């Protein structure tokens, strides 16, 4: 009954040379790691080493063009770096960015491998830059390669091609890249909760609405839970898990659960505007460990209040280690009930549990 933890200080080297206060800070990961030491959670985990993803592994989800362009940034001078970064939606690049993205992905591959070989029951990956906005052919929203999507395909490559992987994305933003990578796939179920605001919230696409249910063989295997017109927190997220996430997940019967665990829906986040508490994230984690015989990998995505993300991630690791859920602190916001109903109507055709 062992929990794995991966963290490597080298992933701090990716940085914004124009704006050293950009919120996707190197110290996001050192702060989370420090809080694990502070709470004496680190000694209770088995340390899994980081490694570099290979280019062949990157090609599980990304085009050779995209891999080659990001790879080449390793040797560019600033004017090439600033120019290339400005060509994407919301990207900064330094000479260390490619290596850090490789380390984030390889850290998660090693963690998924440790879970799938029975060396650990579950695991947490304290990694940056994040992944879930990265597309097959382009970088986006602080993300270069889609770490969680790559980990799903890597897991399939070391087990069987049709291994059922559930990705729960509770970052406050829609994981456009993860949805698109798996949109025609019935072997990877994507469930995202996200602030939507009728398309006005980053990444600003109606791709995030509830009626996008998957394409082709993937019809029914993309579940968008979009929030509008409300400061959502623990009540709304608990309800979404009770009515939608867990019934669908149990029916899917995943063999591996990956969490695209952004903590920017947290109370105090400067960007998300939501109020999920650390106890709330602990309860979401605890529910997901009832799936896949407990095989859960928690992957850091966004989250920009250093204190909030540190407390919130650590509480998730505490649940993975078997600690019992802390106690939650309210009637659902009206629009949250509407959102949950809309999703129930859109996915009841595909999931008899609804
Ligand atoms: O957190 C994020 N995505 O998960 C994110 C992002 F990608 C952006 F481009 C801008 C922004 F303000 C964000 F909070
Ligand atoms: K999300
Ligand atoms: K899918
Ligand atoms: Zn986010």
Whether residue 204 has its Cβ less than 6 Å from ligand 1: no
Q: Is 165 helix (H, G, I), strand (E, B) or coil?
A: strand
Q: Is 101 exposed, middle or buried (0-12, 13-18, 19+ CB in 10 A)?
A: buried
User: Among the residues of the chain, which ranges form H helices?
Assistant: 27-38, 55-58, 64-72, 78-86, 97-116, 147-158, 176-181, 234-240, 246-252, 278-288, 306-320, 334-347
Distance CA(141)–CA(160), nearest Å, equals: 31
Distance CA(308)–CA(101), nearest Å, equals: 23
CA angle 146–204–60, rounded 5-degree value: 15
Distance CA(85)–CA(87), nearest Å, equals: 5
Cα distances (angstroms) measured from residue 280 to each of 258, 277, 319: 18, 5, 11
CA angle 74–78–81, rounded 5-degree value: 55
Residues in the chain: 354
Can 133 be counted among the known catalytic residues? yes
Q: Is 264 annotated as a binding residue?
A: yes
Distance CA(17)–CA(321), nearest Å, equals: 38
Q: 2: which 2 tokens?
A: 């062992």
Distance CA(340)–CA(354), nearest Å, equals: 11
Question: Which of 133, 174, 283, 347 is flagged as catalytic?
Answer: 133
Helices 278-288 and 306-320, axial angle in degrees (round to 10)? 30
Distance CA(353)–CA(163), nearest Å, equals: 21
Q: Is 183 helix (H, G, I), strand (E, B) or coil?
A: coil
CA angle 332–252–227, rounded 5-degree value: 25
CA of 171 to the centre of ligand 2 (A): 4
DSSP code of residue 275: B
Q: Which ligand 1 atom is nearest residue 272's CA? A: 14
Please choose, from the candidates 195, 221, 218, the residue with its C-alpha nearest in 3D space to the C-alpha of residue 208.
195
Q: Is the distance from CB of 37 to CB of 155 less than 8 angstroms?
A: no
Instruction: Mark 318-346 as b/e (b = at least 16 C-beta within 10 Å).
Output: bbbbeeeeeeeeeebbeebeebbebbeeb
Distance CA(68)–CA(54), nearest Å, equals: 12
Cα distances (angstroms) measured from residue 303 to each of 42, 142, 265, 342: 21, 12, 7, 27
Cα distances (angstroms) measured from residue 295 to each of 150, 197, 257, 286: 17, 33, 6, 12
Distance CA(334)–CA(350), nearest Å, equals: 26
Please choose, from the candidates 103, 181, 185, 91, the residue with its C-alpha nearest in 3D space to the C-alpha of residue 139.
91
Instruction: Give the residue numbers spanning the domain of 4.
Output: 1-354
Kindly report the number of other CB atoms within 10 A of residue 239's CB atom: 17
Q: Dihedral sign, CA of 336, 143, 153, 206?
A: positive
Distance CA(198)–CA(201), nearest Å, equals: 8
Distance CA(99)–CA(300), nearest Å, equals: 17
Cα distances (angstroms) measured from residue 108 to each of 94, 127, 134: 22, 8, 16
How many structural domains comprise the chain? 1
Please choose, from the candidates 299, 279, 208, 297, the residue with its C-alpha nearest in 3D space to the C-alpha of residue 238.
279
Whether residue 262 has its Cβ less than 6 Å from ligand 1: yes
Q: Is 205 helix (H, G, I), strand (E, B) or coil?
A: coil
Q: Which ligand 1 atom is nearest residue 173's CA? A: 4
């Amino acid at each position: 009954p062992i929990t794995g933890l991966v963290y490597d200080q080298r992933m701090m080297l990716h940085h914004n040379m124009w704006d050293s206060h950009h919120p996707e800070l190197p110290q996001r990961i050192s702060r989370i790691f420090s809080r694990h030491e502070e709470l004496r959670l680190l000694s209770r985990c088995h340390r899994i080493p980081a490694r570099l993803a290979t280019e062949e592994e990157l090609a599980l989800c990304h085009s050779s063009k995209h891999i080659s362009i990001i790879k080449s940034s390793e040797h560019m001078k600033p004017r090439d770096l600033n120019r290339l970064g400005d060509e994407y939606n919301s990207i900064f690049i330094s000479n260390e960015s490619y290596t850090c993205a490789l380390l984030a992905a390889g850290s998660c591959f090693n963690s998924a491998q440790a879970i799938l070989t029975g060396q650990v029951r579950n695991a947490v990956a304290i990694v940056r830059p994040p992944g879930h906005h990265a597309e097959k052919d382009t970088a986006c929203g602080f993300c270069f390669f889609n770490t969680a999507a790559l980990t799903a395909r890597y897991a399939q490559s070391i087990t069987r091609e049709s291994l059922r992987v559930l990705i729960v994305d509770w970052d406050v933003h829609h994981g456009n890249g993860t949805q698109h990578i798996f949109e025609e796939d019935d072997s990877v179920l994507y469930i995202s909760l996200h602030r939507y605001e009728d398309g006005a919230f980053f990444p600003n696409s109606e791709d995030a609405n509830y009626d996008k249910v998957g394409l082709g063989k993937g019809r029914g295997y993309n579940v968008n839970i979009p929030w509008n017109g409300g400061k959502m927190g623990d009540p709304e997220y608990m309800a979404a898990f009770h009515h939608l996430v867990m019934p669908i997940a149990r029916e899917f019967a995943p063999e591996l659960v990956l969490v695209s665990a952004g903590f920017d829906a947290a109370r105090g986040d400067p960007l998300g505007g939501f109020q999920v508490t650390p106890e709330g994230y602990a309860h979401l984690t605890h529910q997901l460990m009832s799936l896949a015989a407990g095989r859960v990998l928690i992957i850091l995505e966004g989250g920009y209040n250093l204190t909030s993300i540190s407390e919130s991630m650590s509480m998730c690791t505490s649940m993975l280690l078997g600690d019992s859920p802390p106690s939650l602190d309210t009637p659902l916001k009206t629009s949250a009930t509407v959102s949950i109903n809309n999703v129930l109507r859109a996915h009841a055709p595909f999931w008899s549990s609804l």
